[PDB]
Amino acid sequence: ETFKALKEYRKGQHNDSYDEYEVNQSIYYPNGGDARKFHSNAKPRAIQIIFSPSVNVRTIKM
Amino acid sequence: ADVAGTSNRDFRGREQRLFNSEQYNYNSSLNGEVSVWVYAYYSDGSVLVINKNSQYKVGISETFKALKEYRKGQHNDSYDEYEVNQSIYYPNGGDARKFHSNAKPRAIQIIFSPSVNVRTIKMAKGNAVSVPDEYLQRSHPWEATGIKYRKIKRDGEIVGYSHYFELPHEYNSISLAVSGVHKNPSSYNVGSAHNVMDVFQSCDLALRFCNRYWAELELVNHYISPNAYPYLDINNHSYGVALSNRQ
Amino acid sequence: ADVAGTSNRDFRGREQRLFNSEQYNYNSSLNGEVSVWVYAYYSDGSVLVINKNSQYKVGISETFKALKEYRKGQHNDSYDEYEVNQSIYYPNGGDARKFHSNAKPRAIQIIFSPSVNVRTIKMAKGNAVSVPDEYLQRSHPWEATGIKYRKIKRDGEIVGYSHYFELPHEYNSISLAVSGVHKNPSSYNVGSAHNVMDVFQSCDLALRFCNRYWAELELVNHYISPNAYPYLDINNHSYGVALSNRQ
Amino acid sequence: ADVAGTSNRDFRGREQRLFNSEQYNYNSSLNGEVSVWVYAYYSDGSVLVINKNSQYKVGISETFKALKEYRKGQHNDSYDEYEVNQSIYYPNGGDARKFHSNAKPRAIQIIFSPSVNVRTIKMAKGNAVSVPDEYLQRSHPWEATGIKYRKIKRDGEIVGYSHYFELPHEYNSISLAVSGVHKNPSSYNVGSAHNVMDVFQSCDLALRFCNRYWAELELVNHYISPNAYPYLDINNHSYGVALSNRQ
Ligand SMILES: Nc1nc2c(ncn2[C@@H]2O[C@H](COP(=O)(O)OP(=O)(O)OP(=O)(O)O)[C@@H](O)[C@H]2O)c(=O)[nH]1
Ligand SMILES: Nc1nc2c(ncn2[C@@H]2O[C@H](COP(=O)(O)OP(=O)(O)OP(=O)(O)O)[C@@H](O)[C@H]2O)c(=O)[nH]1
Ligand SMILES: Nc1nc2c(ncn2[C@@H]2O[C@H](COP(=O)(O)OP(=O)(O)OP(=O)(O)O)[C@@H](O)[C@H]2O)c(=O)[nH]1
Ligand SMILES: Nc1ncnc2c1ncn2[C@@H]1O[C@H](COP(=O)(O)OP(=O)(O)OP(=O)(O)O)[C@@H](O)[C@H]1O
Ligand SMILES: Nc1ncnc2c1ncn2[C@@H]1O[C@H](COP(=O)(O)OP(=O)(O)OP(=O)(O)O)[C@@H](O)[C@H]1O
Ligand SMILES: Nc1ncnc2c1ncn2[C@@H]1O[C@H](COP(=O)(O)OP(=O)(O)OP(=O)(O)O)[C@@H](O)[C@H]1O
Ligand SMILES: Nc1ccn([C@@H]2O[C@H](COP(=O)(O)OP(=O)(O)OP(=O)(O)O)[C@@H](O)[C@H]2O)c(=O)n1
Ligand SMILES: Nc1ccn([C@@H]2O[C@H](COP(=O)(O)OP(=O)(O)OP(=O)(O)O)[C@@H](O)[C@H]2O)c(=O)n1
Ligand SMILES: Nc1ccn([C@@H]2O[C@H](COP(=O)(O)OP(=O)(O)OP(=O)(O)O)[C@@H](O)[C@H]2O)c(=O)n1
Numbered sequence: 001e002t003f004k005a006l007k008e009y010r011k012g013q014h015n016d017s018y019d020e021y022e023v024n025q026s027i028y029y030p031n032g033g034d035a036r037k038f039h040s041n042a043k044p045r046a047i048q049i050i051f052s053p054s055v056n057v058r059t060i061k062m
Numbered sequence: 063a064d065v066a067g068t069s070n071r072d073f074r075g076r077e078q079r080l081f082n083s084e085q086y087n088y089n090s091s092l093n094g095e096v097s098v099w100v101y102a103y104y105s106d107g108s109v110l111v112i113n114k115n116s117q118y119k120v121g122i123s124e125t126f127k128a129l130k131e132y133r134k135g136q137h138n139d140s141y142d143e144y145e146v147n148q149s150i151y152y153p154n155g156g157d158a159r160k161f162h163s164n165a166k167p168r169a170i171q172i173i174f175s176p177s178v179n180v181r182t183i184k185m186a187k188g189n190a191v192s193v194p195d196e197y198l199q200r201s202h203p204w205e206a207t208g209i210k211y212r213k214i215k216r217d218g219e220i221v222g223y224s225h226y227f228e229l230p231h232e233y234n235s236i237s238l239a240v241s242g243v244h245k246n247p248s249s250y251n252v253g254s255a256h257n258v259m260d261v262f263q264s265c266d267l268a269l270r271f272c273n274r275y276w277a278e279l280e281l282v283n284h285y286i287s288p289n290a291y292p293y294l295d296i297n298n299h300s301y302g303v304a305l306s307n308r309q
Numbered sequence: 310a311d312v313a314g315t316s317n318r319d320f321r322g323r324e325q326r327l328f329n330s331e332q333y334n335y336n337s338s339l340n341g342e343v344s345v346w347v348y349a350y351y352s353d354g355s356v357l358v359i360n361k362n363s364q365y366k367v368g369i370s371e372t373f374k375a376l377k378e379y380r381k382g383q384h385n386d387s388y389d390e391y392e393v394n395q396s397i398y399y400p401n402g403g404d405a406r407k408f409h410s411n412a413k414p415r416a417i418q419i420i421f422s423p424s425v426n427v428r429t430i431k432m433a434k435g436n437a438v439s440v441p442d443e444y445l446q447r448s449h450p451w452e453a454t455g456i457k458y459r460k461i462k463r464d465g466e467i468v469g470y471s472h473y474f475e476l477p478h479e480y481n482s483i484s485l486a487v488s489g490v491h492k493n494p495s496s497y498n499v500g501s502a503h504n505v506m507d508v509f510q511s512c513d514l515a516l517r518f519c520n521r522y523w524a525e526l527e528l529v530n531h532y533i534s535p536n537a538y539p540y541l542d543i544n545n546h547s548y549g550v551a552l553s554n555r556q
Numbered sequence: 557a558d559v560a561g562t563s564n565r566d567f568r569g570r571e572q573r574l575f576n577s578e579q580y581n582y583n584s585s586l587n588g589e590v591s592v593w594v595y596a597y598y599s600d601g602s603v604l605v606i607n608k609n610s611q612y613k614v615g616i617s618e619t620f621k622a623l624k625e626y627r628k629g630q631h632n633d634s635y636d637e638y639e640v641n642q643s644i645y646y647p648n649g650g651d652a653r654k655f656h657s658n659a660k661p662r663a664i665q666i667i668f669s670p671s672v673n674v675r676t677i678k679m680a681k682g683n684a685v686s687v688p689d690e691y692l693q694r695s696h697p698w699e700a701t702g703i704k705y706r707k708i709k710r711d712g713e714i715v716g717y718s719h720y721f722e723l724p725h726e727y728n729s730i731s732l733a734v735s736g737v738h739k740n741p742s743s744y745n746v747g748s749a750h751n752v753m754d755v756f757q758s759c760d761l762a763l764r765f766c767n768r769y770w771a772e773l774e775l776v777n778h779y780i781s782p783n784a785y786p787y788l789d790i791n792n793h794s795y796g797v798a799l800s801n802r803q
C-alpha cells in the first residue's frame with residue numbers, strides 16, 4: 001500500500017479531500033503543499049502486521 | 063559629548079535601561095495587568111489560545127464543549143460532534159460514528175504573566191458536565207495548584223509561570239476554569255471598601271482574546287513573540303523578553 | 310468480629326453514614342458549591358439546561374435569543390429566526406414566515422442546590438429586549454422570588470429548591486437572569502475585606518454547562534440522575550439523593 | 557596530516573568516491589531495486605506519475621480510465637466523463653457533451669532506472685478496451701521496445717532510460733502496461749528454483765507511488781530532483797546524479 005492508501009478514508013462522509021491532496025504534497029516534499037493543518041489526523045498512528053500460524057516467520061519481509 | 067558606552071554620562075543607555083525596568087515594575091504594580099492564557103492543543107497540531115487581561119485578578123472559564131476544536135469556515139462534523147458530546151456527558155449516551163473526537167484537547171498549558179502571585183492560583187478542573195470532584199456535594203470548587211507552576215525564564219528573569227498537563231487518555235474529558243490574583247506585596251487590599259468597586263469594574267473591563275492557530279510554530283511566531291508574551295514550547299524552550307535592569 | 314447489623318461495632322455502617330453526612334454538610338459549608346440550573350422546555354419535548362456551579366454565590370444570565378432552541382448540527386431556520394426575533398423585539402418589526410417560533414421556550418424551571426439560602430434568590434425576568442419591568446427607569450433590577458421556590462424532597466430531606474413558570478402565551482417573551490447566595494449561618498461575611506478577593510476568583514472559577522436534551526426522560530436518565538442533582542419532573546415527582554444521616 | 561586534495565592519503569576523498577560508486581553498483585546488483593515510471597501529461601500542464609520500485613523485475617499496468625486526469629478534491633465532470641468513456645470504448649457509444657476530454661493524456665514518457673536491462677523491456681500498449689493489437693486473437697501481449705529507449709545522461713553516465721510518445725491525435729486512446737527486468741549479467745537465474753519464491757515475494761513487496769503534479773517544473777523540483785531520479789524534460793534536458801567513480 002502507498003502512503004495515501006493507508007490514510008483514513010471515511011466512506012460516505014466528508015474527508016477534507018482537497019486539503020488532504022495539499023497535505024500529501026507537503027509530506028512528499030517538505031513545504032511542497034498548501035495545507036491548512038500541521039498534522040493530518042488521517043495519518044496512521046501505529047501499524048500492526050499479523051500473520052497466520054501457517055507462515056514461516058523466517059520468510060517474512062517488509 | 064562623552065563617547066557612547068564609556069562613561070556614567072551615556073544618558074541614552076540609562077534611559078534605555080530605565081525604560082525596560084519601568085515596564086517590568088509597572089506590570090507588577092497594582093496599576094498593571096495580570097494575564098492568564100489557556101492553550102488547548104489538538105491532535106492536528108493546532109492550538110486554541112484563550113487569553114484574558116485585567117487588573118487586580120484575572121481568570122478564564124470554559125465548558126467541555128468550548129474547549130473542543132472548532133475550525134472557522136470549514137466543516138466540523140457538527141451533528142456527529144453533538145452526538146459525541148452526549149456520549150462524553152454520559153457513558154453510551156450518544157449515537158456518534160467515532161470512538162475518539164479529534165476535536166478533544168490532547169493537552170492544556172496554563173500560563174500566567176509575571177505580575178501574578180503564584181500562591182493565589184486556583185484551578186477548577188471539572189468533569190465533562192462541569193463538576194470539579196466527581197459529585198457537586200464533595201467538590202471543593204478549586205485546587206490551589208501554584209506549586210506545580212514552573213518559572214518561564216529568559217536571561218535569569220521570571221517572564222511568567224507555566225502549568226502543563228496532558229490529556230492523552232480516553233477519559234481525559236474536562237471542563238476548565240483558572241484564576242489568579244495580581245501580586246500585592248502591600249497591606250492595601252484592592253478589594254477592601256476603598257477600592258472594591260474598581261475591582262467590580264475590572265470584571266467588566268477585562269479584555270479577552272481567542273483564536274485557533276494552525277501550529278505551535280505559528281503561535282510562537284505570530285501570537286507569543288510579537289506581543290512579548292511568555293511561552294514554553296514542546297521542546298521545553300522558554301520564550302519571553304527579560305526587562306528588569308537590562309537594555 | 311461482631312456480626313454485621315447487630316451492634317454499635319458495625320464500623321462499616323458508621324462510616325457509610327458518616328460518608329453520606331459529610332457530603333451533605335460539606336456542600337453546605339462555606340467551602341462547598343452552590344449551584345443553579347435553568348431548564349428551558351421546548352414544544353418538541355427537548356430541554357435546554359444551563360448549569361452553573363461555584364463557591365459563595367452563583368447565577369445564570371441569558372438573553373431572549375440564547376434561550377431559544379438551537380439544534381446543533383441540524384437546520385434551525387436561522388434567517389427566518391432572525392426575522393422572528395426582530396418581530397419579538399418590536400411589534401411588527403420583522404418579516405418572519407411564522408406566527409409563533411417553536412424555538413421559544415414554553416416553560417422555565419429554576420432549580421437551586423440545597424446549599425443555597427432561599428431568601429437570597431433574586432430573578433431578573435426581563436422583556437425580549439432585556440428590561441426587567443417595562444422601562445429601565447422604573448425597573449428594579451430583580452425580584453426576590455424565594456417564597457415561590459418549592460422544596461424538592463427525597464426521604465424527608467430537602468434535595469433542592471424549584472421555581473417553575475410556564476410561558477404558554479404568545480407574549481411570554483423573556484430574557485432571564487437568576488442569582489443565589491450560598492448559605493452562610495455564620496457572621497463571617499465571605500465578601501468582607503478578609504475574603505472578598507476569593508469571591509472575585511469564584512466569579513472566574515464558576516464552571517458552566519449547557520446542552521439540549523431531546524426529552525425530559527433523557528434529562529432524568531442522563532443529566533439529573535448520574536450526577537445526583539435535584540429535579541422535579543412534569544408529573545411532580547422529586548428526584549435527588551437524601552444524604553444526611555443515611556446509609 | 558597530509559593536506560586535503562594533494563595526496564593518495566586524502567581518505568575523505570576516497571571514501572566519498574567509494575560511497576557514490578557503492579550506491580551505483582548496489583542499485584545494479586541483484587540485491588538492488590529496478591524502477592519504472594509512467595508519466596501521463598495532460599493538456600492543463602499537469603502530470604500524473606505512477607512509479608513502481610521492486611527487486612528483480614518491475615512493471616506498471618493501467619486501464620484507459622486510470623490514466624485520465626483526476627483532480628483530487630476538485631470537480632472532474634465525473635458523470636460526463638463516464639459518458640465520454642462509453643464513446644471512447646465504442647464509437648458513438650456514449651452521450652457526452654464534449655468532443656475531446658481534456659482528461660485524456662497528451663503524451664506518455666516511460667522511464668526506467670539504470671538497473672534495468674533495456675533488452676528486457678516490454679510494452680502492452682492497448683486500445684481503450686485493453687486489447688494490445690486490434691483483436692485479442694492476433695494480439696501479441698507485448699512489444700519489445702527497448703531499441704527506442706534513449707539514454708538519460710548526466711556527466712557521461714547513464715542515469716536511466718527514456719521512451720517518450722505523444723498522443724496528440726483524437727484516436728490516441730490507450731490502456732498501458734510496461735515491464736522491465738533488473739540487469740543480471742550472471743548465469744544465476746533469479747527465478748530458477750533456488751530463488752523463485754523470493755521473486756514471488758518481490759511481487760508483493762513492490763512499492764507503488766502516484767500523484768498528479770500541477771506542472772513539469774513541480775515534477776522536476778519536487779518529485780525527480782529530491783529523490784535523485786532520472787528525467788528528461790520537454791526541452792530535452794537530462795536530470796539525474798552521476799555516481800560511478802565520482803565525488
Ligand atoms: N553576563 C555575561 N554575559 C555574557 C558573557 N559572555 C557572553 N555573554 C552574553 O552577554 C549577554 C548579557 O551581557 P551584558 O548585558 O552586557 O552584561 P550584564 O550581565 O547584563 O551586566 P550590565 O549590562 O553591565 O548590567 C548574555 O545574555 C550573554 O548571551 C559573560 O561572560 N557574562
Ligand atoms: N422509617 C421507616 N421506613 C420504612 C418503614 N417501612 C418501610 N420503610 C422503608 O425503609 C426506608 C428507611 O428505613 P431505615 O433507613 O432502615 O430506617 P431509618 O428511619 O432511616 O432509621 P435508622 O437507619 O436506624 O437511622 C424508607 O425509605 C422506606 O421506604 C417504616 O415503618 N419506617
Ligand atoms: N573532466 C573535465 N572537467 C572539466 C574541465 N573543465 C571544467 N570541467 C568541469 O569539471 C567537472 C569534473 O571535473 P573532475 O571531477 O575534477 O575531473 P574528472 O574528469 O572526474 O577526474 P577525477 O575526479 O580525477 O577522477 C565537469 O563536470 C566539468 O563541468 C575539463 O577540462 N575536463
Ligand atoms: N557565559 C556566561 N557567564 C556568566 N554569566 C552569563 C553567561 N552567559 C549569560 N550570563 C548571565 O547569567 C545570567 C543568566 O543568564 P542565562 O541566559 O544563562 O539564563 P536563562 O536564559 O534564564 O536560561 P538558559 O540560558 O539556561 O536557557 C544573566 O545575567 C546572564 O546575562
Ligand atoms: N411507612 C413508613 N412509616 C413511617 N415512616 C416512614 C415510612 N416510610 C418511610 N418513612 C420515613 O419517614 C420519613 C419520610 O420519608 P418519605 O419517603 O415518606 O418522604 P419523601 O420521599 O420526602 O416524600 P414522598 O414519599 O411523599 O414522595 C423518612 O425518615 C422515611 O425513612
Ligand atoms: N571541457 C571539458 N573537456 C573535457 N572533458 C570534459 C569537459 N567538461 C566535462 N568533461 C568530462 O567529459 C565527460 C562527459 O561530461 P559531460 O557533462 O560533457 O556529458 P553529459 O552531462 O552526459 O552531457 P551534456 O554536457 O552534453 O549535457 C565527463 O567525464 C566530464 O567530467
Ligand atoms: N488548502 C485548501 C484546502 C481546502 N480548500 C477548499 O476547501 C473546500 C472544501 O473542503 P474540501 O478540502 O474539499 O473537503 P470537504 O468539502 O470538507 O469534504 P470532502 O472531502 O467530501 O470534499 C474546497 O472547495 C477547497 O476549494 C482550499 O481552497 N484550499
Ligand atoms: N451520528 C450521526 C452523525 C452525522 N449524521 C449526518 O451527517 C450529516 C453531515 O455531517 P455533519 O455531522 O452535519 O458534519 P458536516 O456536514 O460534515 O460538517 P458541518 O459541521 O459543517 O455540518 C448530517 O446531515 C447528519 O444528518 C447522522 O445522521 N448521524
Ligand atoms: N423571512 C424569510 C425567511 C427565510 N428566507 C430564506 O430562507 C432560506 C433558507 O431558510 P433559512 O431561514 O436560512 O433556514 P434553513 O436554511 O432551513 O436552515 P438553517 O438555519 O441551517 O439556515 C434562506 O436562504 C433565506 O434567504 C427568506 O428569504 N425570508
Ligand SMILES: Nc1ccn([C@@H]2O[C@H](COP(=O)(O)OP(=O)(O)OP(=O)(O)O)[C@@H](O)[C@H]2O)c(=O)n1
Nearest residue numbers: 630631632633634635636637638639651652653
Ligand atoms: N452527459 C451528461 C453530462 C452531465 N450531466 C449532468 O451534469 C451534472 C453535473 O456534472 P457532473 O458530470 O456530475 O460533473 P460535476 O458535478 O461538474 O463535477 P464532479 O465530477 O465532482 O461530479 C450531473 O448531475 C449530471 O446529471 C448530464 O445530465 N448528462
Ligand SMILES: [Cl-]
Nearest residue numbers: 090091092093
Ligand atoms: Cl501600586
Ligand SMILES: [Cl-]
Nearest residue numbers: 337338339340
Ligand atoms: Cl465553613
Ligand SMILES: [Cl-]
Nearest residue numbers: 584585586587
Ligand atoms: Cl548480486
Ligand SMILES: [Mg+2]
Nearest residue numbers: 011012013014
Ligand atoms: Mg455520503
Ligand SMILES: [Mg+2]
Nearest residue numbers: 134135136137
Ligand atoms: Mg465556510
Ligand SMILES: [Mg+2]
Nearest residue numbers: 215216217218
Ligand atoms: Mg539564556
Ligand SMILES: [Mg+2]
Nearest residue numbers: 140141382383
Ligand atoms: Mg450539520
Ligand SMILES: [Mg+2]
Nearest residue numbers: 462463464465
Ligand atoms: Mg419517599
Ligand SMILES: [Mg+2]
Nearest residue numbers: 017018629630
Ligand atoms: Mg473537495
Ligand SMILES: [Mg+2]
Nearest residue numbers: 709710711712
Ligand atoms: Mg554535462
